[PDB]
Amino acid sequence: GRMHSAGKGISSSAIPYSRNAPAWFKLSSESVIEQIVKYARKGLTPSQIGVLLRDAHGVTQARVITGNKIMRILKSNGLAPEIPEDLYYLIKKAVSVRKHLERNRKDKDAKFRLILIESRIHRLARYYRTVAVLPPNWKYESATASALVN
Amino acid sequence: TRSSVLADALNAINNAEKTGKRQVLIRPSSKVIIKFLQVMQKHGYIGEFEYIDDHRSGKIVVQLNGRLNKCGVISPRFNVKIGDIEKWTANLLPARQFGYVILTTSAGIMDHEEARRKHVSGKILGFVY
Amino acid sequence: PQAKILSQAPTELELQVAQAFVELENSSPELKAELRPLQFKSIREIDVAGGKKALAIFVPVPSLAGFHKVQTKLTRELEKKFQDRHVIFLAERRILPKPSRTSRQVQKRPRSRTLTAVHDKILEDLVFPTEIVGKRVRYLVGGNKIQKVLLDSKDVQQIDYKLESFQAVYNKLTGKQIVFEIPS
Amino acid sequence: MENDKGQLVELYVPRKCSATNRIIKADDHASVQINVAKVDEEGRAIPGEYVTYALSGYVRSRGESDDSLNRLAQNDGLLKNVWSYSR
Amino acid sequence: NRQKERLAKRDAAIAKMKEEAALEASKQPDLKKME
Amino acid sequence: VLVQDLLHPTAASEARKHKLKTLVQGPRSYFLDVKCPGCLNITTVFSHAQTAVTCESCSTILCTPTGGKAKLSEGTSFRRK
RNA sequence: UUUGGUUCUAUUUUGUUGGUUUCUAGGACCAUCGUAAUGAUUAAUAGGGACGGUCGGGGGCAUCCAAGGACGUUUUCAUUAAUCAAGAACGACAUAAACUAUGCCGACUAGGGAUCGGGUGGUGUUUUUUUAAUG
RNA sequence: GUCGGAUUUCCAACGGGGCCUUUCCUUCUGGCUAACCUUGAGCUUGGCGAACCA
């Protein structure tokens, strides 16, 4: 696909066929749940959590070790962010690009990529509004984008 | 993007039979593919086929005989009443003695002859001869 | 007592295996109180082509990990205790029917309560110490489907004599025919 | 094919390829008929006793005549370990 | 949620009775290890 | 080839392909259990480590991230788990 | 099956028509008791996002700034997607023989070698510190 | 078995219904109580409401 480019490259993860996994892991479920809540207490996104349990310890996926996925147990433990991580990284990239544009006016490909980034932002905002993980009337504007990064 | 999975399935069958190979891989295996190949199998057009399952959607391996001329899909699935069944078989079949138009009715997916016997109609899926 | 190990329905043979359960409970203190909390719902007799019948022991679903901890040991004692027998532990799961158009809605049916999900679960629970590496379905020209299950080649010595017993009990329970293969 | 009651019709029921099981047309001038003589316990072939394999022009033109000939030769038993099902 | 409380109560009861009989199991000697 | 076994490809050619192009897709990576000099403290490290993984007891970093398989440090003792 | 409290309506009758009620009959609201296997579909060779080493005569500014593709991934989301009237940005004011004179997305179908970016393996070659890791 | 018409115990095919396999495929007041454990001796005195409705 790659709507905002022309690349057709396929590069991703190949999840193993073993749904119950991996018969060499000795820690318990509650051990890794307390690991995720301790690691998310200090302010990390769930992608960083997944890679950091993937490489420091033996965790293939948190979905197959526990019974459920990651921000399911984060929202059950009360550590769900007010906006999820993908939209947050998109809007922080947007305000960084807008800071570049207000610094340098003539970076005109930066204008083009800013329109691309806000297109992705509006698509994710529409999807998050129709599933109501965001309230309706929530809208992205630049003045609230400067402070919405938090 | 990949819209009609059955269309890509039947296209793979058509290309493999035109090249002359006796086996073909299909990705990614909806239910209507399984019913379609069951209908083609019960009439002696393909033979045995195999359902590989990964945990995503599944793959089909079909052993092909030399008995297939063309299988095809009809997109979109038009609504077909009783008179439109023989208007369709007049339209897109080779002859009046063989060839089968496949349609899904509320009593399952079947060819036009046993749909005539059950006296039911539905939505047209495709054809095989 | 033998009545405590039985959950609801008393017959003679489940009382006998409950006596075997409490006899294994009082002996072997290394595994004592590991088999104490668990009870089993029911017992089923399966006839196989080999002539040695099968004890399908249906247990509660939430207690299944407790059987999974000590399953090899208690199954070995259960083969020893009963001659010409093969013992298997299954979890009695609930199948909820598919809601039709005319029927009134009874909540939302969870996806673990469908027929295919519980059939795959009891197929996994037949072969416990091995792990299934792949499945296939043979669609024959006569219309019959025969499902082939591939087992991981490690530790197959526990279950290699019991494969036709697995085929018989799966054919009785689900009405589908399966063939086991070991890729090497 | 037939009409209603006997009287066999359809002159020239055509041969069919032994590889892809398609029929061979009358002017398919690339189609061949391989005739293999069989041997009876002495190392010598008997004149008039054959097995026969018809190959169409399409499979021969694609170059796939030899692999298919391997497969039907090994299927009839006169070949031992040249063609593999697993490729 | 009465159901989660009931689940936690039955889990705690099972664990407590398991530990209570595990004390008696540790009190009893093992002829299997000696053999 | 016009007749071949798509059900049972040979092990060499099914190990030859890309990881998504096989019969069923699966990962070609693996986990190692690595012991560091000094304290024992056996660790499990994924092959494409993606970060500077250290021992939990002390800053004795075992792998540095690399765009493919991550390189391991000079003094280790690792096994494939 | 139950056990509380609140509230509303109500026939046969109690000796009659009206008036105060109780039990009962039927609601609706509230409380905590017990029943259940307590309850969330995969993670599409779909897509978005994080991460790691890179790669590019990409861009701007001055003489650093952010962005992007591919690769790798047992990381995260979960169908967020394809094409697009109106509208908008850029375009040697809105043009061109703006061309691949060939719209975009998706699948399949014969090959062969060279090349670019990445990755895997080969006790392969060479260099360093003959020898390691790199390259 | 009638003099080119038609039947029955029958091998088969084709579509239908009912029951069981974890599979309620809404139920309350009423009546017919229906198919009634209802059996009087080989056609009698008494089961569950839709198969009939409100």
State whether the Cα torsion B9-B13-B15-B21 is positive or negative: positive
Chains E and D touch (3+ CB pairs under 8 A): no
The residues spanned by each domain of chain B are 1-68, 69-129
Provide φ and ψ at B86, rounded to 5°: -80, -20
B102: left (phi over 0), alpha (psi -120 to 50) or beta: beta
The length of chain C, given as a count of residues: 184
Sort strands B71-73 and B122-128 into parallel, antiparallel or unpaired.
antiparallel
**H/E segment holding residue C89:** strand C85-91
Q: Is the CB of A66 under 7 A from strand G?
A: no
Chains E and C touch (3+ CB pairs under 8 A): yes
Please answer whether residues D38 and D45 qualify as being in contact, where contact means their C-beta atoms are separated by less than 8 angstroms. Answer: yes
Contacts of F27 in chain B (CB under 8 A): none
Task: Say how far apart CA A77 and CA A37 lie, in whole Å.
Answer: 8
Contacts D–F by Cβ distance under 8 A: 25
Among all strands, which nt has the closest C1' to B110 (CA)? H15
- Closest CA relative to residue F7, chosen from F20, F21, F24: F24
Tell me how far CA of residue C184 lies from CA of A48, C132, C180, F14, in angstroms: 38, 13, 13, 14
* CB-contacts to strand H (7 A): B 107, 114, 117-120; C 92-97, 99-100, 102-104, 106, 118, 122, 175
State whether the Cα torsion B101-B104-B108-B109 is positive or negative: positive
User: Gap from A122 CA to G81 C1', in Å?
Assistant: 14
The torsion angle over the Cα atoms of residues E9, E11, E12 and E17, rounded to 10 degrees, is 120
User: Gap from D39 CA to G15 C1', in Å?
Assistant: 126
The residues spanned by each domain of chain D are 1-87
- CATH 3.30.1230.20 for domain D1-87, yes or no, is yes
Range of the domain at F80: 1-81
- Closest CA relative to residue C35, chosen from C47, C48, C23, C50: C23
Please answer whether residues A111 and A101 qualify as being in contact, where contact means their C-beta atoms are separated by less than 8 angstroms. Answer: yes
- Closest CA relative to residue B55, chosen from C118, A17, F19, C130: A17
Output b/e per residue, D22-36; b: 16+ Cβ within 10 A: bebeeebeebeeeee
- Closest CA relative to residue C171, chosen from C140, C153, C147: C147
- Token readout for F73 is 């440090």
Q: Which residues partner with B71 through β-bridges?
A: B128
Output b/e per residue, A93-121; b: 16+ Cβ within 10 A: ebbebbeebeeeeeeeebeebbeebbebb
Say whether C6 sits in a helix, a strand or coil. strand
If you count DSSP H runs as helices and E runs as strands, how many of each does chain E have, helices first? 2, 0
Tell me how far CA of residue A103 lies from CA of A106, A110, A131, A145, D87, in angstroms: 9, 11, 37, 17, 62
Tell me how far CA of residue E3 lies from CA of A77, C157, D45, E6, E8, in angstroms: 19, 42, 86, 5, 9
Minimum distance, in Å, between the CA of residue C134 and any CA atom of chain A: 8
Sort strands C177-181 and C145-151 into parallel, antiparallel or unpaired.
parallel
**H/E segment holding residue F14:** helix F11-16
For tokens 């590991």, the residue is C34
On whether any CB of chain E is under 8 Å from the CB of C69, the answer is no
If you count DSSP H runs as helices and E runs as strands, how many of each does chain B have, helices first? 4, 8
For tokens 């010598």, the residue is D44
Q: How many domains does chain F have?
A: 1
- Token readout for D36 is 């293999």
Query: Which residues neighbour E8 within 8 Å (Cβ) at sequence distance 6 or greater?
Result: none
Query: Which residues neighbour D1 within 8 Å (Cβ) at sequence distance 6 or greater?
Result: D9, D10
Provide φ and ψ at B105, rounded to 5°: -110, 175
Please answer whether residues C165 and C88 qualify as being in contact, where contact means their C-beta atoms are separated by less than 8 angstroms. Answer: yes
Output b/e per residue, B52-79; b: 16+ Cβ within 10 A: bbbeeebbbbbbbeeebeebbbbeebee
Q: Could you say which DSSP state residue A46 is in?
A: H
| Resolution stated for this PDB structure, in Å | 3.0
- Exposed, middle or buried by CB within 10 Å (0-12, 13-18, 19+), for C149? buried
User: Gap from A92 CA to G94 C1', in Å?
Assistant: 34
Q: Which residues partner with D53 through β-bridges?
A: D34
Q: Could you say which DSSP state residue A29 is in?
A: H
Task: Say how far apart CA F9 and CA C86 lie, in whole Å.
Answer: 36
Residue of F nearest to D70 (CA): F3
Q: Which residues partner with F32 through β-bridges?
A: F45, F80
Task: Say how far apart CA B45 and CA B65 lie, in whole Å.
Answer: 7
Q: Which nucleotides of G are covered by protein (CB under 7 A)?
A: 32-54, 58-61, 65-78, 80-83, 89-91, 105-110, 118-121, 133-134
Task: Say how far apart CA C145 and CA C131 lie, in whole Å.
Answer: 23
Please answer whether residues C164 and C50 qualify as being in contact, where contact means their C-beta atoms are separated by less than 8 angstroms. Answer: yes
**H/E segment holding residue C79:** helix C64-81
**H/E segment holding residue B18:** helix B5-19
Q: Is the CB of C112 under 7 A from strand G?
A: yes
End-to-end CA distance of chain F: 39
- Token readout for C154 is 């490690």
Say whether B7 sits in a helix, a strand or coil. helix
